[PDB]
Design goal:
1 chains, about 2050 residues, mainly beta, 36-stranded antiparallel β-sheet, about 5% helix, TcdB_toxin_mid/C, virulence
């Protein structure tokens, strides 16, 4: 909940990129990228699309690898083509199998629309529920109607998929057969709609042969237009009746363009276009649905269109829908496969110009066989004899092919093995091993389960087998063939497949890894067999009949099925496989031909070499071989000819095999030669799989690099490593997965790299469901690689070990082994299997093996365990930082269907260990889900905080710890078992038409707190806590924490309803705040009989407990978050909003479409208005409550670029000139904007340069080489349409020759800066001739982080930036000066690792990183982090360093002093004084441990400050070291503080020993209602009424004596009158009566500053008691004097002039950076005289050179490493006299240790010239222990008696002195020892501290601690300054009166009394002296920059004095004394007194 508030965006700052993000997806092991589209949120209900990459993905309309998946529901094809009948299975939108839910029913209508037939509707749900959406299948009983799907989502949405033919993929031959129902429309639960219109495939743009050979290519559907922002609310799906969409009915359109529209940067595309589709080169076809689906299109643009004429009816659209944002997708087009290699966001300005972002470049692994073709001898096969009769095939299913051969009449296999070093990809083969089968027993073409595997996987074909009758029986041997290369229905043939197979098959000769040449047995039935056999209407070639023709199975189309292929000497022909034995009409694949007289089919091999999918065709010559690459199953490219190993001639005795010996998925050439040696050679055409994404560059300073490694190589590593130990691991992954193995992130600006390296093991493959379960073990290793010159302190590699369930128990069970072992840890988790019965979970054991299979399957993918380690040299390197582990629960929701059960998988338990590398003393929390409802919502949850282990014997903590610290880290709050117990109740709306899920109803939290011995086992788990004897059983007690209930409305009636409506409108929220317990805090402050009423008056209400227990009555709640909603026709949009029943509602006025709020009217009627820019739906103009205008403008990308404001000050129009009055075209390049001069009619102007990292080509270089040259450069996307150099393309173009020298050579470093933005900021309005233009430039990095900021400063000395970005330290004067601040260097995880001090530069431009790193005087602090991301070390620029050690129960902080010994006064003193923070098992700091030490050799006192938190988690007690010590001997000592809270954590009662007991009750608005102070005063506050904002109106106070209240404060707030607006007083407290008078507000400015106010004071005799409602009786209590202060400010709000209540005028002047640089004063009547005439600053903004009106100069000196103040010279140039040069010296942490004045003494000290250096010494807590100094001789002993000044006549002297300070253990200064030898005035001041508190008094008042506390009032106010001087105090705790001298017998005392403002400022001081000789009254009135001092007697007014103050005290404030009378003779009038101060002023 939040009250709506209108505001305008801010410009400049960081630079946001495309938003692309690289995703992890650990267990599956793929590289996955997310790239967002420019979709407008519109009204709120909009399409959710992202453009996604995944390395495992094939080709798509978005190129190879990507997709833009829309929600589709489709038939299941995994196990083969669907049959389009009652047996097909359906997949939901996320791919899960769908299962019949309910029994079907008959419906002929839907949402009041008539469907025109009786539909049978069937319920469906996922077999692995997650979202819990519900699906419906609507099937017409009567023909002529189409079937469709509904999805009732769990969030009220309803989706319609596949009703209209435009949104379904069907077989164009028999259109009845539906393959995919695509999302057609959807509607929200509040009346918002979305319609998805696709666009079927056609022949437009295709060439002749494409259309000729691909018939009825209309099946494919492409996404074309998405309509949303419906103009008329409705809960009905659009286009349900069947109508097409009308663009006028919508506000927003998302258009996917596939080439129709123009694609240039000069003109914006048009919503409607006659343009023609583009036909891609890599056209492809898919056949898994039983028919061809052709794809010919590539999406070239994604365009957002707004209906501006409808959003703002003052806009007229001639083109049609207007373009608001554009996304260009440019490809690397190829006939083999197109790849998305360029992505760029673009916007079009109104003037035609375009605004652009840096493009995202992407690069994929290319395939260059010519450069990579090298034959290497297979040295490993020298002992391998066989050359002609052996198969290189993966029999055992390991992912790599082994050696399958026969020798000596036996059969032998040889698995693949790692060659030597683990991690290398080298491969060999292990010692032979006999096959588990015997080929002799087998029949011909027989299925067989090789190597004892359960499943039949291979087919055997040989002469010696039964049934072999080959017509050409020459040179054939027993052969094995994988069943996956043959069609799916080979087992039971049918149709064309059956006719082709005919009688049978003789041989099956693998010619590739997946391609099988076919030979048939002697035919019968068609005995003639003249070549072809006829099947249906297709002629099939009989395999082997024609010896001049190859006949084989091979996926020459790259689609996933074993197609039929014939190869003649002249053409390759393909019959595609349509499943069930169906084969389609033949397609000719042009491009391959051999001379008919030479062609030999035995020389043809089919294998995927390019890895693009389709099989490539290798024809083997004698001295070479030709490689025909496949052009997307559309033909073959020109051959790549490869030579053989020199001197080799391939003949019929040699052998060639195409085998994946690399595991890359591509194939390599395995050559075998008998007569030459070595006999076996190997050619790898690529060592990296091609076409996978491997490079990114956002052209903003980030370069990503991906590297993959085959899962098979990880299998080899796993096998080898697991074979070091004598164990046999089983491979459960029988094929390659190209896993993401390294992600390298390179910051091109900082040079910092970050390499994240991934290992995999325990890969799992399900043979039953033919799915990949994932990798059981995934290892991750982040390694920072910072640039050279950086700090030697890097962050060492961080290692995360993750174990994920696979659902295969043989693996999951054993995963427990690799876990890090802890004999003390709790029992590991086992997955829980339950069945849904009687509305709850019932644990079962899965009955049969099938149930086991499914139950375990559900577990797949869940993170079981994660362990974090730091890989450094620490002695705990092998101990994890953190260890998390998880327990899954699988529930059986339904068992009806016999095939699959319906299961829900959830994580019921989670456990979190924090060891921090300390194996002996971990923290452990654990969350459990005890029960949940049918829809998965939790009903009972338990959060477990475990206790600390009792102190072990083997101390694993470091021995460098302070002594006794570890034992002092133990606390009883650490030894409590804490069980937070949360109950929840929900609302579900479920029927055949409604599904709203997860709606909250009620929540309750209690908490069990148990002794540490109750921790069982082995630990707690779901079962021990669900038991009868559980610790959380219903009979065991528990501390109630709170409860909340959500209150819904129907939108029309107030009374909350029992069951929410589909809209789920939240009326309000009911929250418990009090119970009886917490109410005990008001005992004594609010009488019992009067308590309820009071709470009622404050807004609280009584209500029963939720989930009430026996004996619970009532609690007090607050209702908050009230909303009054509009009608359904208004999209149920909020119209009014109100926080509580105590305040009025604010009213929201929406635009005409209920998209945005255009006006707010608060409960007082103050109006805020917002004009929007409907290109983006962002506010761009604001009319404030004072009817003033604030305007901005936006560029075509939505970024603010200009800000103005104007309005009325003092009833007059002022401000910046509107664009009508004065126009201003903002600059485009930062340089010209910087070269701008005054005036400007803007407050601000932004200029964005995101593309500044891309070098730009010289226009004159464009002229130098132009057009043809440029066109070649541009076509390959080296250059953009604008002169931008694309970094990645250029990179892959330098390493590619034939480019010829790059005359274009500005990528040669030079003019490239990080992304940056400029902000110009005017300080005066445009019609002000002294307007300056402030200039700031901010630099971002490619991740969008702030690097540095430059601010134009007044000319002067500054360092220099070279032409190449080099930093030069030697300073020099310049007129182009910039303060550089914020300079930072990050690593690639965003962590700041170097932070530099500010510095002046002669340029705004960025300084190269290595330049600043290589320079020491570029002072930089280094930061050092741990793998958790916490600072652990900081090495300052001066050398010192701080350090932080994190341990599970305490954190140790060593500061610069504490560590000075490891690298000032005495480093051994501060040795081992760290500050320790000791936590409990709730992360709450329960102890602060310090180590006190005064001398280097003393042993440390241990200071313990103990904090105790109640079981609500609230700070209950705090006790300091000395009372903690005193309490160990007497436990009746009250702690320093004792707090009592409510149930939400608000403090109610504060019992302080120092400040007393304070009680406070707030109202449901959070406002103080009733306070009771420690002295007894009752403060009651009175606010506005329930129809108003609820501002403060009165403050009343009632002492215990006063029997009636006194009204101390009245507030009078302004209204809406046009006069108030004319003075900008709306909503302001115009008349404020306080304790000392009234403050009146007369005029505010456009910047909210006060232009005129006036104070009036009470007559001295009247206490402030504003009673009644008549303001005149109040005004009569005032003194007539009106002190009016009035001022004028600049455009930024800075003060320019101020006029005090006596006409004197201070004037200020600022510089080009907003720093004060001038100060003048004009006394009433006199002329203006300067006070400050010059003032320069340091780069950090600290005062530097100040020249006062007396020509005296002050020069400040700063330590460059730290900016610490080290010098204050004060000199007078008229006589070259150094009046006061103070020099400071600090210790490392910054304590002042020495102050020496290098000036010579003043003329006031006789014969004294030298002033001694002051020295100060501290202890380990930095308490001042010793001090030396100088003092005038005649000072004597110190007290409140001020000395008389020394005069030049007296010839006085000053001596040295030493003071020594003795402090308590609670921080109290107990003793001061002043020793001054020469003077001989040695004394000791003693302070008596109370024994039970920190009240302490001067010894002269008492020496007895037990009597000190009674020297203070109840609230710690000392009521006796000194014995005889009584002190009285306000009712607010402010000093009321000092009785300076008492007098008896009714006489009058000497007294000083004070009057303060309502907010605590002293306004009036009156010193009264009743000395008889002259009864003198001094009166001081404190006013803004003015003091009025008036001294009177009973007879006349002696003195009248005005003290003017120029500056703020402590900063060289200059006072001026002006006398209206009583001026003494010996002082000029209007005296100027310039103050000159020290460090602390």
């Amino acid at each position: 909940f939040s009250i709506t508030e209108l505001s305008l965006p801010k410009g400049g700052g960081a630079i946001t990129g495309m938003g692309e993000a690289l995703t992890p997806t650990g267990p599956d092991g793929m590289a996955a990228l997310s790239l967002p589209l420019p979709i407008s949120a519109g009204r709120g209900y909009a399409p959710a699309f992202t453009l996604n990459y995944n390395s495992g993905a094939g080709n798509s309309p978005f190129g190879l690898g990507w997709d833009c998946n829309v929600m589709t529901i489709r038939r299941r094809t995994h196990f083969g083509v669907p049959h389009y009948d009652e047996t097909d299975t359906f997949l939901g939108p996320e791919g899960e199998v769908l299962v019949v839910a309910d029994q079907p029913r008959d419906e002929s209508t839907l949402q009041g629309i008539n469907l025109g037939a009786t539909f049978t509707v069937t319920g469906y749900r996922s077999r692995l529920e997650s979202h819990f959406s519900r699906l419906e299948y609507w099937q017409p009983k009567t023909t002529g109607k189409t079937d469709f799907w509904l999805i009732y989502s769990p969030d009220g949405q309803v989706h319609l998929l596949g009703k209209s033919p435009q949104a379904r993929i069907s077989n164009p031959s028999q259109t009845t057969q539906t393959a995919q129902w695509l999302l057609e429309a959807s509607v929200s639960s509040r009346g918002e709609q979305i319609y998805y219109q696709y666009r079927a495939e056609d022949d437009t743009g295709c060439e002749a042969d494409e259309i000729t050979h691909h018939l009825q290519a209309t099946a494919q559907r492409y996404l074309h237009i998405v309509y949303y922002g419906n103009r008329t609310a409705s809960e009905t799906l659009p286009g349900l009746d069947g109508s097409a969409p009308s663009q006028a009915d919508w506000l927003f359109y998302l258009v996917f363009d596939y080439g129709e529209r123009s694609n240039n940067l000069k003109t914006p595309p048009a919503f409607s276009t006659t343009g023609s589709w583009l036909c891609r080169q890599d056209r492809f076809s898919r056949y898994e649905y039983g028919f061809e689906i052709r794809t010919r299109r590539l999406c070239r643009q994604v365009l957002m269109y707004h209906h501006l004429q409808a959003l703002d009816s003052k806009i007229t659209e001639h083109n049609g829908p207007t373009l608001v944002s554009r996304l260009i997708l440019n490809y690397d087009e190829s006939a083999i496969a197109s790849t998305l290699v360029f992505v760029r966001r673009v916007g079009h300005e109104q003037d035609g110009n375009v605004v652009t972002l840096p493009p995202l470049e992407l690069a994929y692994q290319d395939f260059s066989p010519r450069h990579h073709a090298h034959w290497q001898p297979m040295d490993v096969l020298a002992n391998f004899n066989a050359i002609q009769r052996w198969q290189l095939v993966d029999l055992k299913g390991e992912g790599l092919p082994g050696l399958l051969y026969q020798d000596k009449g036996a059969w032998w296999y040889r698995s693949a093995q790692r060659l030597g070093e683990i991690g290398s990809d080298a491969v060999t083969w292990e010692k032979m091993q006999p096959l588990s089968v015997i080929p002799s027993l087998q029949s011909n073409a027989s299925l067989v389960d090789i190597n004892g595997d359960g499943q039949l996987d291979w087919v055997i074909t040989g002469p010696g087998l039964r049934g072999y009758h080959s017509q050409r029986p020459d040179g054939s041997w027993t052969r094995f063939t994988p069943l996956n290369a043959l069609p799916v229905e080979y087992t039971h043939p049918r149709a064309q497949l059956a006719d082709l197979m005919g009688a049978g098959l003789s041989d099956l000769v693998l010619i590739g890894p997946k391609s099988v040449r076919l030979y048939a047995n002697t035919r019968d039935g068609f005995a003639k067999g003249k070549d072809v056999v006829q099947s249906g209407d297709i002629t099939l070639p009989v395999p082997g009949a024609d010896p001049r023709k190859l006949v084989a199975f091979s996926d020459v189309l790259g689609s996933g099925q074993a197609h039929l292929v014939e190869v003649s000497a002249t053409k390759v022909t393909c019959w595609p496989n349509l499943g069930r034995g169906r084969f389609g009409q033949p397609i000719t694949l042009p491009g391959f031909s051999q001379p008919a007289t030479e062609f030999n089919p035995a020389q043809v091999y089919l294998a995927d070499l390019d890895g693009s999918g389709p099989t490539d065709l290798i024809y083997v010559h004698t001295n070479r071989l030709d490689i025909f690459l496949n052009k997307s199953g559309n033909g073959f490219a020109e051959p790549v000819t490869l030579r053989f190993p020199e001197g080799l001639r391939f003949d019929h005795t040699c052998q060639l095999q195409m085998a994946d010996v690399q595991g890359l998925g591509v194939a390599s050439l395995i050559l075998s030669v008998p007569h030459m040696s070595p006999h076996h050679w190997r050619c790898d055409l690529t060592n990296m799989k091609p076409w996978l994404l491997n490079e990114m560059n956002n052209n903003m300073g980030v370069h990503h690099t991906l590297r993959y490694r085959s899962s098979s190589q990880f299998w080899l590593d796993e096998k080898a490593a697991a074979l070091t130990t004598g164990q046999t691991p089983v491979c459960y992954l029988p094929f390659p997965i190209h896993t993401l193995w390294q992600t390298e992130t390179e910051d091109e600006i900082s040079g910092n790299k970050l390499v994240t390296t991934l290992r995999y093991a325990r890969g799992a493959w399900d043979g039953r469901e033919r799915e990949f379960r994932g990798f059981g073990y995934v290892e991750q290793t982040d390694s920072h690689q910072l640039a050279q010159g950086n700090a030697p302190e890097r962050t060492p590699p961080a290692l995360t070990k993750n174990w994920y369930a696979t659902g295969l128990p043989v693996i999951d069970n054993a995963l427990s082994t690799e876990y890090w072992r802890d004999d003390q840890a709790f029992a590991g988790f086992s997955p829980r299997f339950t069945t849904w019965q009687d509305n709850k979970d019932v644990p079962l054991t899965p009955e049969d093996d099938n149930s086991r299979y499914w139950f375990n399957r559900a577990l797949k993918g869940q993170l079981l365990r994660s362990e974090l380690y730091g890989l450094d040299d620490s002695t705990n390197k092998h101990v994890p930082y953190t260890v998390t582990e998880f327990r899954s629960q699988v529930r059986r929701l339904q068992h009806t269907d016999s095939r699959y059960p319906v299961l829900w998988s959830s994580v019921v338990e989670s456990r979190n260990y924090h060891y921090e590398r300390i194996a002996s003393d971990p923290q452990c929390s654990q969350n459990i889900t005890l029960s949940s409802d049918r829809f998965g919502q939790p009903l009972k949850q338990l959060s477990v905080q475990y206790p600390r282990r009792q102190q072990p014997a083997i101390n694993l903590y470091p021995d460098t710890l302070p002594d006794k610290l570890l034992a002092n880290s133990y606390d009883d709050q650490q030894r409590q078992l804490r069980l937070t117990y949360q109950q929840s109740s929900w609302h579900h709306l479920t029927n055949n038409t409604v599904r709203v899920l997860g709606l909250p109803d009620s929540t309750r939290s209690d908490i069990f707190t148990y002794g540490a011995e109750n921790v069982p086992a082995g630990g707690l788990n779901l079962e021990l806590l669900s038991d009868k004897n559980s610790l959380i059983a219903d009979d065991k007690p528990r501390e109630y924490l709170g409860q909340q209930k959500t209150a819904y409305t129907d939108g029309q009636n107030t009374t909350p309803l029992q069951t929410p409506t589909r809209q789920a409108l939240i009326a309000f929220t009911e929250t418990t705040v009090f119970n009886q317990s917490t109410l005990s805090a008001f005992n004594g402050s609010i009488p019992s009989d009067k308590l309820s009423t009071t709470l009622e008056q404050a807004g609280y209400q009584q209500t029963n407990y939720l989930f009430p227990r026996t004996g619970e009555d009532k609690v007090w709640v607050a209702h908050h978050g009230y909303t009054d909603y509009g009608t359904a026709a208004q999209f149920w949009r909020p119209q009014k909003q109100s926080n509580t029943q105590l305040t009025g509602k604010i009213t929201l006025i929406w635009d005409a479409n209920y998209c945005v709020v255009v006006q707010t009217r608060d409960a007082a009627g103050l109006t805020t208005s917002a004009k929007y820019d409907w290109r983006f739906l962002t506010p761009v103009q604001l009319t404030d409550i004072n009817d003033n205008q604030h305007l901005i403008t936006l560029d075509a990308l939505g970024r603010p670029i200009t800000l103005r404001f104007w309005g009325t000050e003092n009833g007059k129009m002022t401000g910046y000139s509107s664009p009508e009055k004065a126009s201003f075209s903002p600059p485009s390049d930062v340089n010209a904007a910087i070269e701008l001069k005054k005036p400007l009619p803007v407050a601000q102007c932004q200029v964005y340069a995101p593309e500044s990292w891309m070098p730009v080509l010289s226009q004159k270089t464009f002229n130098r080489l132009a057009e043809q040259d440029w066109q070649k450069l541009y076509n390959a996307r080296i250059i953009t349409e604008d002169g931008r150099i694309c970094t990645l393309a250029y990179r892959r173009w330098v390493q590619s020759q034939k480019a010829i020298p790059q005359l274009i050579s500005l990528l040669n470093n030079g003019p490239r800066l990080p992304p940056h933005s400029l902000t110009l900021t005017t300080d005066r309005y445009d019609h002000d001739p002294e307007q300056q233009i402030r200039q700031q430039v901010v630099f971002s990095d490619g991740f969008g982080r702030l690097l540095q900021a430059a601010a134009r400063h007044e000319a002067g000395m500054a360092r220099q930036r070279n032409e190449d970005g080099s930093l030069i330290i030697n300073v020099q004067h310049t007129e182009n000066r910039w303060a550089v601040t914020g300079r930072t260097e990050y690593d690639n995880k965003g962590q700041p690792i170097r932070t530099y001090q500010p510095y002046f530069l002669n340029d705004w431009r960025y300084v190269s990183n290595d330049s600043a790193r290589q320079e020491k005087e570029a002072y930089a602090d280094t930061h050092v982090y741990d793998p958790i991301g916490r600072e652990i070390k900081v090495i300052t620029a001066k050398g010192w360093f701080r350090r932080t050690l994190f341990t599970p129960w305490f954190t140790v902080n060593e500061d610069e002093n504490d560590t000075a010994a490891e690298v000032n006064i005495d480093p051994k003193l501060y040795q081992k004084t760290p500050t320790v923070s000791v936590y409990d098992n709730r992360g709450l700091i329960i102890r602060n441990i310090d180590f006190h030490r005064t001398t280097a050799n003393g042993d440390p006192d241990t200071r313990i400050t103990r904090h105790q938190y109640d079981i609500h988690g609230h700070l209950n007690q705090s006790i300091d070291p000395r009372l903690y010590e005193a309490k160990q001997t007497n436990n009746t000592i009250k702690p320093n503080f004792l707090w009592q809270y409510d149930l939400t954590g608000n403090p109610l009662c504060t019992e302080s020993i120092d400040a007393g007991r304070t009680v406070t009750l707030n109202d449901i608005e959070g406002r103080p209602l009733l306070t009771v102070t420690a002295t007894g005063v009752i403060q009651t506050r009175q606010y506005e009424t329930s129809s108003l904002p609820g501002r403060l109106l009165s403050v009343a106070e009632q002492t215990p004596e006063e029997k009636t209240s006194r009204i101390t404060e009245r507030l009078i707030w302004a209204g809406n009158t046009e006069a108030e607006k004319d003075h900008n007083l709306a909503g302001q407290c115009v008349r404020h009566y306080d304790t000392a008078g009234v403050t009146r507000l007369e005029s505010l400015s456009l910047t909210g500053t006060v232009l005129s106010q006036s104070s009036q004071l009470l007559i001295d005799t009247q206490e402030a008691n504003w009673t009644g409602d008549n303001e005149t009786v109040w005004q009569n209590m005032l003194a007539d004097d009106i002190y009016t202060t009035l001022s004028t400010f600049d455009a930024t709000g800075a003060l320019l002039t101020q006029t005090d209540a006596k006409g004197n005028i201070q004037r200020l002047a600022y510089d080009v950076a907003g720093q004060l640089n001038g100060s003048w004063l004009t006394l009433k009547g006199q002329t203006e005289q300067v006070i400050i005439k010059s003032l320069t600053y340091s780069a950090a903004g600290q005062k530097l050179r100040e020249e006062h009106g007396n020509d005296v100069i002050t020069e400040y000196s700063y330590e460059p490493e730290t900016q610490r103040l080290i010098g204050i010279k004060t000199r007078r140039p008229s006589d070259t006299k150094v009046l006061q040069d103070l020099r400071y010296e600090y210790d490392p942490v910054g304590n002042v240790i020495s102050i020496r004045n290098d000036a010579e003494a003043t003329r006031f000290w006789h014969n004294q010239k030298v002033m001694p250096e002051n020295t100060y010494t501290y202890d380990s807590l930095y308490q001042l222990i010793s001090a030396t100094g100088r003092e005038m001789a005649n000072i004597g002993q110190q007290s409140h008696q001020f000395p008389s000044p020394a005069l030049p006549s007296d010839n006085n002297t000053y001596t040295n002195y030493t003071r020594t300070y003795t402090y308590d253990r609670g921080g109290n200064l107990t003793k001061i020892q002043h020793s001054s030898p020469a003077t001989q005035n040695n004394y000791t001041t003693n302070i008596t501290v109370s024994n039970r508190s920190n009240r302490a008094v001067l010894s002269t008042l008492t020496e007895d601690p037990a009597q000190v506390d009674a020297l203070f009032d109840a609230g710690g106010h000392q009521n006796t300054l000194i014995s005889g001087q009584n002190l009285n105090w306000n009712t607010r705790g402010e000093l009321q009166q000092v009785t300076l001298v008492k007098r008896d017998k009714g006489a009058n005392d000497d007294r000083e009394w004070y009057r303060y403002s309502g907010d605590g400022r002293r306004m009036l001081k009156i010193n009264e002296q009743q000395a008889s000789n002259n009864a003198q009254t001094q009166r001081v009135t404190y006013l803004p920059n003015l003091e009025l001092r008036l001294t009177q007697n009973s007879t006349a007014t002696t003195e009248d004095l005005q003290v003017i103050t120029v500056g703020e005290a402590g900063r060289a404030q200059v006072r001026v004394l002006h006398w209206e009378s009583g001026k003494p003779e010996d002082i000029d009038n209007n005296q100027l007194r310039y103050s000159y101060d020290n460090l602390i002023g």
